[PDB]
Write an enzyme that holds these catalytic residues in place. Structure first.
Site, PDB file in Angstrom:
ATOM      1  N   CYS A  82     -30.970 -31.586 -21.945  1.00 54.78           N
ATOM      2  CA  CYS A  82     -32.209 -31.447 -21.193  1.00 54.78           C
ATOM      3  C   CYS A  82     -33.215 -32.547 -21.524  1.00 54.78           C
ATOM      4  O   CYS A  82     -33.977 -32.967 -20.658  1.00 54.78           O
ATOM      5  CB  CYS A  82     -32.823 -30.082 -21.470  1.00 54.78           C
ATOM      6  SG  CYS A  82     -32.944 -29.695 -23.231  1.00 54.78           S
TER       7      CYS A  82
ATOM      8  N   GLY B   2     -33.167 -22.816 -18.507  1.00 56.87           N
ATOM      9  CA  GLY B   2     -32.293 -23.115 -17.378  1.00 56.87           C
ATOM     10  C   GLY B   2     -32.931 -24.020 -16.350  1.00 56.87           C
ATOM     11  O   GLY B   2     -33.776 -24.855 -16.683  1.00 56.87           O
ATOM     12  N   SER B   3     -32.534 -23.846 -15.094  1.00 57.55           N
ATOM     13  CA  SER B   3     -32.958 -24.743 -14.028  1.00 57.55           C
ATOM     14  C   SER B   3     -34.334 -24.390 -13.472  1.00 57.55           C
ATOM     15  O   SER B   3     -34.769 -23.237 -13.525  1.00 57.55           O
ATOM     16  CB  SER B   3     -31.927 -24.766 -12.897  1.00 57.55           C
ATOM     17  OG  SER B   3     -31.940 -23.547 -12.177  1.00 57.55           O
TER      18      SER B   3
ATOM     19  N   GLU C 105     -38.221 -22.737 -20.034  1.00 59.99           N
ATOM     20  CA  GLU C 105     -37.799 -24.025 -20.550  1.00 59.99           C
ATOM     21  C   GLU C 105     -36.854 -24.626 -19.522  1.00 59.99           C
ATOM     22  O   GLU C 105     -35.672 -24.282 -19.463  1.00 59.99           O
ATOM     23  CB  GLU C 105     -37.127 -23.851 -21.910  1.00 59.99           C
ATOM     24  CG  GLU C 105     -38.058 -23.315 -22.994  1.00 59.99           C
ATOM     25  CD  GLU C 105     -38.890 -24.400 -23.655  1.00 59.99           C
ATOM     26  OE1 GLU C 105     -38.667 -25.595 -23.361  1.00 59.99           O
ATOM     27  OE2 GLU C 105     -39.769 -24.059 -24.478  1.00 59.99           O
TER      28      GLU C 105
HETATM   29  N1  LIG Z   1     -35.977 -27.012 -21.529  1.00 62.46           N
HETATM   30  C1  LIG Z   1     -34.889 -26.598 -22.179  1.00 62.46           C
HETATM   31  O1  LIG Z   1     -34.959 -26.119 -23.298  1.00 62.46           O
HETATM   32  C2  LIG Z   1     -33.540 -26.723 -21.531  1.00 62.46           C
HETATM   33  C3  LIG Z   1     -32.395 -26.706 -22.329  1.00 62.46           C
HETATM   34  C4  LIG Z   1     -31.147 -26.825 -21.734  1.00 62.46           C
HETATM   35  C5  LIG Z   1     -31.067 -26.950 -20.353  1.00 62.46           C
HETATM   36  N2  LIG Z   1     -32.182 -26.960 -19.600  1.00 62.46           N
HETATM   37  C6  LIG Z   1     -32.074 -27.109 -18.150  1.00 62.46           C
HETATM   38  O2  LIG Z   1     -31.139 -26.200 -17.563  1.00 62.46           O
HETATM   39  C7  LIG Z   1     -30.532 -26.814 -16.418  1.00 62.46           C
HETATM   40  C8  LIG Z   1     -29.024 -26.589 -16.458  1.00 62.46           C
HETATM   41  O3  LIG Z   1     -28.749 -25.306 -17.029  1.00 62.46           O
HETATM   42  P1  LIG Z   1     -28.439 -24.011 -16.117  1.00 62.46           P
HETATM   43  O4  LIG Z   1     -28.222 -22.834 -17.041  1.00 62.46           O
HETATM   44  O5  LIG Z   1     -29.474 -23.931 -15.025  1.00 62.46           O
HETATM   45  O6  LIG Z   1     -27.009 -24.386 -15.477  1.00 62.46           O
HETATM   46  P2  LIG Z   1     -26.660 -24.325 -13.907  1.00 62.46           P
HETATM   47  O7  LIG Z   1     -27.574 -25.257 -13.155  1.00 62.46           O
HETATM   48  O8  LIG Z   1     -25.167 -24.482 -13.792  1.00 62.46           O
HETATM   49  O9  LIG Z   1     -27.044 -22.829 -13.460  1.00 62.46           O
HETATM   50  C9  LIG Z   1     -26.092 -21.770 -13.516  1.00 62.46           C
HETATM   51  C10 LIG Z   1     -26.811 -20.541 -14.048  1.00 62.46           C
HETATM   52  O10 LIG Z   1     -27.829 -20.129 -13.127  1.00 62.46           O
HETATM   53  C11 LIG Z   1     -27.788 -18.710 -12.992  1.00 62.46           C
HETATM   54  N3  LIG Z   1     -28.228 -18.258 -11.654  1.00 62.46           N
HETATM   55  C12 LIG Z   1     -27.883 -18.800 -10.468  1.00 62.46           C
HETATM   56  N4  LIG Z   1     -28.467 -18.128  -9.444  1.00 62.46           N
HETATM   57  C13 LIG Z   1     -29.202 -17.135  -9.981  1.00 62.46           C
HETATM   58  C14 LIG Z   1     -30.076 -16.050  -9.472  1.00 62.46           C
HETATM   59  N5  LIG Z   1     -30.283 -15.888  -8.144  1.00 62.46           N
HETATM   60  N6  LIG Z   1     -30.654 -15.228 -10.379  1.00 62.46           N
HETATM   61  C15 LIG Z   1     -30.463 -15.368 -11.707  1.00 62.46           C
HETATM   62  N7  LIG Z   1     -29.685 -16.330 -12.240  1.00 62.46           N
HETATM   63  C16 LIG Z   1     -29.042 -17.226 -11.442  1.00 62.46           C
HETATM   64  C17 LIG Z   1     -26.335 -18.337 -13.218  1.00 62.46           C
HETATM   65  O11 LIG Z   1     -26.218 -16.993 -13.690  1.00 62.46           O
HETATM   66  C18 LIG Z   1     -25.869 -19.362 -14.230  1.00 62.46           C
HETATM   67  O12 LIG Z   1     -26.045 -18.857 -15.553  1.00 62.46           O
HETATM   68  C19 LIG Z   1     -30.897 -28.294 -16.457  1.00 62.46           C
HETATM   69  O13 LIG Z   1     -31.869 -28.586 -15.448  1.00 62.46           O
HETATM   70  C20 LIG Z   1     -31.526 -28.485 -17.820  1.00 62.46           C
HETATM   71  O14 LIG Z   1     -32.570 -29.458 -17.826  1.00 62.46           O
HETATM   72  C21 LIG Z   1     -33.404 -26.853 -20.148  1.00 62.46           C
HETATM   73  C1  LIG Z   2     -33.194 -28.218 -32.375  1.00 60.40           C
HETATM   74  C2  LIG Z   2     -33.015 -28.199 -30.883  1.00 60.40           C
HETATM   75  N1  LIG Z   2     -33.985 -27.962 -29.961  1.00 60.40           N
HETATM   76  C3  LIG Z   2     -33.444 -28.025 -28.719  1.00 60.40           C
HETATM   77  C4  LIG Z   2     -33.947 -27.874 -27.437  1.00 60.40           C
HETATM   78  C5  LIG Z   2     -33.087 -28.015 -26.354  1.00 60.40           C
HETATM   79  C6  LIG Z   2     -31.733 -28.302 -26.525  1.00 60.40           C
HETATM   80  C7  LIG Z   2     -31.180 -28.465 -27.791  1.00 60.40           C
HETATM   81  C8  LIG Z   2     -32.010 -28.331 -28.890  1.00 60.40           C
HETATM   82  N2  LIG Z   2     -31.884 -28.411 -30.204  1.00 60.40           N
HETATM   83  S1  LIG Z   2     -30.485 -28.725 -30.908  1.00 60.40           S
HETATM   84  O1  LIG Z   2     -29.433 -28.098 -30.157  1.00 60.40           O
HETATM   85  O2  LIG Z   2     -30.491 -28.201 -32.243  1.00 60.40           O
HETATM   86  C9  LIG Z   2     -30.220 -30.297 -30.970  1.00 60.40           C
HETATM   87  C10 LIG Z   2     -29.595 -30.956 -29.918  1.00 60.40           C
HETATM   88  C11 LIG Z   2     -29.364 -32.327 -29.993  1.00 60.40           C
HETATM   89  C12 LIG Z   2     -29.760 -33.036 -31.121  1.00 60.40           C
HETATM   90  F1  LIG Z   2     -29.544 -34.360 -31.202  1.00 60.40           F
HETATM   91  C13 LIG Z   2     -30.384 -32.379 -32.171  1.00 60.40           C
HETATM   92  C14 LIG Z   2     -30.613 -31.012 -32.092  1.00 60.40           C
END
Ligand SMILES: NC(=O)c1ccc[n+]([C@@H]2O[C@H](COP(=O)([O-])OP(=O)(O)OC[C@H]3O[C@@H](n4cnc5c(N)ncnc54)[C@H](O)[C@@H]3O)[C@@H](O)[C@H]2O)c1
Ligand SMILES: Cc1nc2ccccc2n1S(=O)(=O)c1ccc(F)cc1
Ligand SMILES: NC(=O)c1ccc[n+]([C@@H]2O[C@H](COP(=O)([O-])OP(=O)(O)OC[C@H]3O[C@@H](n4cnc5c(N)ncnc54)[C@H](O)[C@@H]3O)[C@@H](O)[C@H]2O)c1
Ligand SMILES: Cc1nc2ccccc2n1S(=O)(=O)c1ccc(F)cc1
Ligand SMILES: [K+]
Ligand SMILES: [K+]
Ligand SMILES: [K+]
Ligand SMILES: [K+]
Lengths: 446, 447
Positions: free
Chosen positions: B243, B187-188, B209
């Site tokens: 992300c 998440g964030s 992550e």
């Molecule tokens: N590194 C990775 O694998 C990866 C993958 C996908 C997304 N991301 C990152 O996630 C971010 C967006 O996803 P997101 O899920 O943050 O969406 P978002 O920014 O809309 O956050 C909303 C989420 O935050 C939670 N939240 C808010 N306040 C909270 C608190 N006080 N306590 C606990 N939980 C709380 C909510 O429950 C909700 O699920 C982006 O910055 C993205 O880069 C990282």
């Molecule tokens: C394998 C994998 N590792 C990830 C890590 C973060 C977000 C998506 C991820 N994925 S994914 O959802 O399978 C994926 C997402 C996009 C893509 F082009 C290929 C794979």
């Protein structure tokens, strides 16, 4: 403030790129090597004044392992720091797939008092080898080592990259507001939670090297001469002030008296009839801890020792028998020369006993039977394991040292120190040439 | 509470020893293989309703990599779980020295919404393989996937060991009071701090992550046709909600117009003239995020796109030129189909630019010059790196996936998942025979 400036200067020096070349890091480590050789008496002095160590055990139970770590890391650094190729797929044959190791930035090492040189400098060695700036916060309890390190480190090492910060709680709280790229903390479970809380504010990864009660299970049908000699050695060195000391014994009631007698024989061998007269026997770090350890003897059956001197902080090697698991001495980390013996009637009961408590930093088992060894390991969880010896499992470069659960998170020593104080960065390098095999991924979909 | 009971039942089921044998773990992984095969259409429907994904990209941009991960782990589990012998020393000749792998206990996986199946189940696969009980907390934002997973997971996986807990902020706050042995949070950056703060109370290790702005440096003397096609693909998949998407471009002002033109050509190839008509183009997850991303377009020089539809949460693929690095679109993770171009006058300026900002999850560079590639890598820090492509580095078993600094801590995928969700326990086994060599260590010390 002094703390804020020291940290600023440390980051500025890291940002300049100074630590990146391997030769710079090696030269810092060779300077450390020279510091240890040239300041050996001073180091002995500090340890003698803090913990009543002598020139022998100051070296062979602490200092030498720092030197071995330095030598090992200098030799291995080229290999560890190299880009590491990883296994390719049929689709990635034309690509470079590798792991790139890079410094984290400014590392904070918070040391503890029981091994105040090793537990400040050995983490530092790894962090230096990984190319980090390293801020040191030595324990204030070991006052003499704390004072000495603040004096001698800047004499040999880069003054900006590797500052020493001394102080108590407020100074540490102040330090923990600064932004680091990694924190290695050695100390208590309780303060460990405070460290991690502070680290969360800057999303700083932590290595927490914490405590607990390391159980020592002794099997009913093993050589008790060898076993108790090894156990007494580990339990009573540094006056019991070792994180991986065999905290307590688990044994059948039928061997409890035999264990008492053999520990007895070994302790007399080590420190004479009166341990107060042995130059090899240590003292308690502080009055506060002296009182604590003495308080754990109250209301217990003393089979050996039991007496202490408040003026010199001496506590006689104490052995307790038929110890109630709910009594104070079995409800906290002893960290003293008081060895309680708790009776269990089977291996199964021993496993349950260990499992119902917090995960220890070390687990020890003494047994001629290998199935006993493997069964206990498979059914318990601990930071590390040593079978048929104590302490030594943390002296080997090839075995990462760390806890699990309440005994801590992360690990270091040898290659693990390099990894822990580095970011391991996955890299994919492709040719920028038209590849028809990649076409399948592009929209529009079939 | 229902939360407390679910965590309690999970710990109880783990404490029974059920997960320890490898056959049991493999059987759970095979059940997930079964889930994916039998629920393919339902998984597609969820992703279509949540993110406007289609049957192709629902599978080939998400689901298939969970399957590959499962197949890979089933095969390698015997190898990974075996005690690992390590190098001896001159004194440890008669000893056994090895690393023993064991589960941590109850693992909590907090998923996010952008890839709501992959980022809930891929971490779960690793945690299952390592012999843990696994509590799943799916994102509430991807509503359809959250509901589906709550239904289908217990239909295939052990009900006590692997519960699904749905909820918002209040439910997550309560869940974070429970004691876990590991938490993987996706998440964030901001909420990552909250999770780590909660974990501190139980001394629970964390894999975070997180996010950031992944830079994409484009060198002058490289094939821009090939480069921009690869960039456009990575940036505009999932409507920019990735992300590891190339968040923004850094390039010389002399190649800016060429980049714009070639990105436009690629986008027309991908989604046609009007991307709103393309089955392959996604939608923004929520009204809040729609407004947020549209807000980032305001006051900028639009070179392509720049329009949206609130009713369908559609945002046209957008390219912005001569973007002020201090403007809103360059001060937060975009997570949308808006691609700003920021001008730098040299590789050195680009390196400095990246270094002044927080460490990104991914860093991209496009160049025919290997020295430029190697210099940018050596002088920057990011979670992962791809040169001459985007996204792909996260799809490979041999490359651990994770951030650094603000982009996160720890990593997973492949063997790294097994290691991350295990405790690696250093073991020394000595003979209980008299050893003369050890006698030197015992007191009394020599004079
Ligand atoms: N590194 C990775 O694998 C990866 C993958 C996908 C997304 N991301 C990152 O996630 C971010 C967006 O996803 P997101 O899920 O943050 O969406 P978002 O920014 O809309 O956050 C909303 C989420 O935050 C939670 N939240 C808010 N306040 C909270 C608190 N006080 N306590 C606990 N939980 C709380 C909510 O429950 C909700 O699920 C982006 O910055 C993205 O880069 C990282
Ligand atoms: C394998 C994998 N590792 C990830 C890590 C973060 C977000 C998506 C991820 N994925 S994914 O959802 O399978 C994926 C997402 C996009 C893509 F082009 C290929 C794979
Ligand atoms: N795993 C290892 O490598 C290892 C090694 C040695 C010791 N230990 C563990 O350390 C423990 C004993 O060492 P110790 O240093 O905790 O002894 P201690 O608890 O007596 O020392 C008190 C220390 O805690 C600090 N402190 C107190 N309150 C604080 C706060 N609010 N914020 C920050 N710091 C605060 C003080 O500055 C002081 O240095 C034992 O449990 C032992 O197992 C672990
Ligand atoms: C190498 C090492 N790792 C340690 C971890 C914790 C405490 C002391 C430690 N040491 S040590 O000080 O060198 C050490 C301490 C005691 C001993 F018997 C052998 C070595
Ligand atoms: K008693
Ligand atoms: K195509
Ligand atoms: K293995
Ligand atoms: K001797």
């Amino acid at each position: 403030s002094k703390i804020s400036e020291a940290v600023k200067r440390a980051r500025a020096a890291f940002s300049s790129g100074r630590t990146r070349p391997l030769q710079f890091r090696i030269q810092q480590l060779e300077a450390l090597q020279r510091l240890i050789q040239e300041q050996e008496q001073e180091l002995v002095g500090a340890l003698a004044a803090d913990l009543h160590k002598n020139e022998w055990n100051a070296y062979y139970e602490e200092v030498v392992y720092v030197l071995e770590e330095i030598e090992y890391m200098i030799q291995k650094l080229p290999e560890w720091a190299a880009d590491e190729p990883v296994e390719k797929t049929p689709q990635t044959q034309q690509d470079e797939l590798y792991i790139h190791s890079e410094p984290l930035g400014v590392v904070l090492v918070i040391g503890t008092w029981n091994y105040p040189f090793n537990l400040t400098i050995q983490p530092m060695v790894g962090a230096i080898a990984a190319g980090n700036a390293v801020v040191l916060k030595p324990s204030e309890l070991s006052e003499n080592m704390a004072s000495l390190l603040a004096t001698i480190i800047p004499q040999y090492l880069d003054k900006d990259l590797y500052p020493v910060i001394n102080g108590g709680v407020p100074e540490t709280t102040e330090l923990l507001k600064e932004r680091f790229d990694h924190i290695l903390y050695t100390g208590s479970t309780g303060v460990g939670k405070i460290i991690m809380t502070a680290a969360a504010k800057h999303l700083t990864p932590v290595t927490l090297e914490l405590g607990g009660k390391s159980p020592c299970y002794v099997d009913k049908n093993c050589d008790l001469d060898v076993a108790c000699r090894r156990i007494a050695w580990g339990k009573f060195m540094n006056s019991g002030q070792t994180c991986v000391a065999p905290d307590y014994i688990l044994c059948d009631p039928s061997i409890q008296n035999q264990i008492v007698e053999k520990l007895k024989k070994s302790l007399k061998e080590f420190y004479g009839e009166d341990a107060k007269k042995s130059r090899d026997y240590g003292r308690i770090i502080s009055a506060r801890h002296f009182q604590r350890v003495m308080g754990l003897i109250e209301g217990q059956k003393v089979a050996y020792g039991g007496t202490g001197d408040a003026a010199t902080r001496y506590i006689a090697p104490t052995i307790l028998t038929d110890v109630d698991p709910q009594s104070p001495v079995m409800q906290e980390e002893i960290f003293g020369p008081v060895l309680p013996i708790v009776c269990v009637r089977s291996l199964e009961e021993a496993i349950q006993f260990i499992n119902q408590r917090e995960k220890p930093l070390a687990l020890y088992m003494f047994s001629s039977n290998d199935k006993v060894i493997k069964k206990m390991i498979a059914e318990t969880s601990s930071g590390g394991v040593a079978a048929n010896d104590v302490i030594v499992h943390i002296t080997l470069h090839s075995l990462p040292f760390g806890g699990v659960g309440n005994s801590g998170m992360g690990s270091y020593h040898g290659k693990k120190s390099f990894e822990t104080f580095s970011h391991r960065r996955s890299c994919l390098v492709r040719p920028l040439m038209n590849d028809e095999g990649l076409k399948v991924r592009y929209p529009p979909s079939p």
